Amino acid sequence: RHRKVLRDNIQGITKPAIRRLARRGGVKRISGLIYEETRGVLKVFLENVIRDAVTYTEHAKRKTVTAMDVVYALKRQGRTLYGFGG
């Protein structure tokens, strides 16, 4: 009902999702106040890679974020990701 207008998307990573996510990484039982902290952790992770991959594309004199720049932005941290054209 137009009450989030691009604000509460950090709540889009829902509490069952990180519940689901730690099951793959093998955490057995989660305490209830974890979900707000990893919301901040994930966002400060994205606030590097979006910060970098914009700066590539803004150097590329164009506005669409392409694919390989993300890999090049992820190289700048030292987290190489495969299977996306490089």
Contact positions toward DNA, by CB under 7 A? 6-7, 11-12, 14-17, 19-20, 29-33, 57, 60, 62-64, 66
* Cβ proximity to DNA, 9 vs 41, nearer residue: 9
3-state SS, residue 55 = helix
Contact call for residues 30 and 22 (beta carbons, < 8 A)? yes
Q: Tell me the C-alpha distance between 54 and 81, whole Å.
A: 18
**Residue 15 interaction partner, one of other proteins, DNA, none, beta carbon < 5-8 Å per kind:** DNA
Q: How many residues does the chain have?
A: 86
Residue 22 as a binder of other proteins (CB under 8 A): the answer is yes
